[PDB]
């Protein structure tokens, strides 16, 4: 059984593109039925790390469970969750964002150090997706995240990498100079994944529990 992505790419579908999500809901598939042309892909420009590896692993999975890895209402009390919308990902004429990610911004003129984690109790291998924002100008970065030396730290027994975003003026793509770079990992059952950052983090709103067999 294929997956029939249509105009959507895997990167667009894996992340929750707004014009994508209207057509996908499967649990046990084996193929792709996808067109590489991303009419509905990364609505925000950037690089999907280990994309090629990620298509192989998603292909042919027995189970597909989408669950709230970090509830938007409860997980981030000291940060703003309602202002992370853009026209690059606009839907039905209104600015929107990925259905599976979350753009934390400053709350009450402060971006406190954040520390949150998931201990994989689902007994199945879990797919966790996060992004790191790279703004175009220093003033936008200061307005949204306050700190000018931002850091993002993701640590697990299987994955460990610390991101340091930088302010770069990149050619305009989808009317946006800034970029988010997208990263992923697979969480073993019984393993914990930790996010520590002071800004520029696109937090995972939803994660996928799967079994390839």
């Amino acid at each position: 059984a294929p997956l029939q992505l249509g105009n959507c790419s895997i990167a667009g579908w894996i992340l929750g593109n707004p014009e994508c999500e209207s057509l996908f809901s499967k649990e046990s598939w084996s193929y792709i039925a996808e067109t590489p042309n991303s009419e509905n892909g990364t609505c925000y420009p950037g690089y999907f790390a280990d994309y090629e590896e990620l298509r192989e692993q998603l292909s042919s999975v027995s189970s597909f469970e989408r669950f709230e890895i970090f509830p938007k209402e409860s997980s981030w009390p000291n940060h703003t969750v309602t202002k992370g919308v853009t026209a690059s990902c606009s839907h039905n004429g209104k600015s929107s964002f990925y259905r599976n990610l979350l753009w934390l911004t400053e709350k009450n003129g402060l971006y406190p150090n954040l520390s949150k984690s998931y201990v994989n109790n689902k007994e199945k291998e879990v797919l966790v997706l996060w992004g790191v924002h790279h703004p175009s100008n220093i003033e936008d970065q200061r307005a949204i995240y306050h700190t000018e030396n931002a850091y993002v730290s993701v640590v697990s027994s299987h994955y460990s990498r610390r991101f340091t975003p930088e302010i770069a003026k990149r050619p305009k793509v989808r009317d946006q100079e800034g970029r988010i770079n997208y990263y992923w990992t697979l969480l073993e059952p019984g393993d914990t994944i930790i996010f520590e950052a002071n800004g520029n983090l696109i937090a995972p709103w939803y994660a996928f529990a799967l079994s390839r067999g």
Partner: antibody
Amino acid sequence: QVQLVQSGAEVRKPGASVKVSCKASGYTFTDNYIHWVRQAPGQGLEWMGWIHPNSGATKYAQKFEGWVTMTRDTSISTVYMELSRSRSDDTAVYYCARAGLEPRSVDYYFYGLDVWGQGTAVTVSG
Amino acid sequence: SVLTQPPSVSVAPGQTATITCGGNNIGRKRVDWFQQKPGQAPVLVVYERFSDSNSGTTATLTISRVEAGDEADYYCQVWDSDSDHVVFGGGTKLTVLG
């Protein structure tokens, strides 16, 4: 509901530090920015700067950087602008406004000036 | 930076009034309009009669069925990221004839 009260009109000789007070009620002082603008008599307004009570961070316009100093006291929920070194052209009415228009998008992340103060008349002529 | 507004506009009562605010790269940026009656602290224009429509290099504020109380001084405002400064417009003395 929310309101901003300002110190009354002070008259001073040129070269003297004049300080204006702006007090906030009906909202948690730590929440929003407070900007200061000035309006020369019969002219338009000129943005001067802003300060956030939660962080204490300040930011000034180029023309006003150096001589103006903006402080705050969370305990009394009051924000201050000090006008060190007065000169005649500073005679104007000075307003304080809170930035309560929350931005909708990350593209334009700027809180707009929703509620203003009564205005303080600073007169310097000697 | 350097937003430009008209010195004065005159509209007959019950008609429509348009105020032009010109500057570079208004584009994605929203424009806040402030209304200052004489001897009064300016207040933000929030919004049937009041409506804005920004397109490209110019933002416009339109008032429908102008009234005597609507008459005042109008001021557009935009934050300039590069200059890091909040920019205020020069000013519009709208005059509902009456």
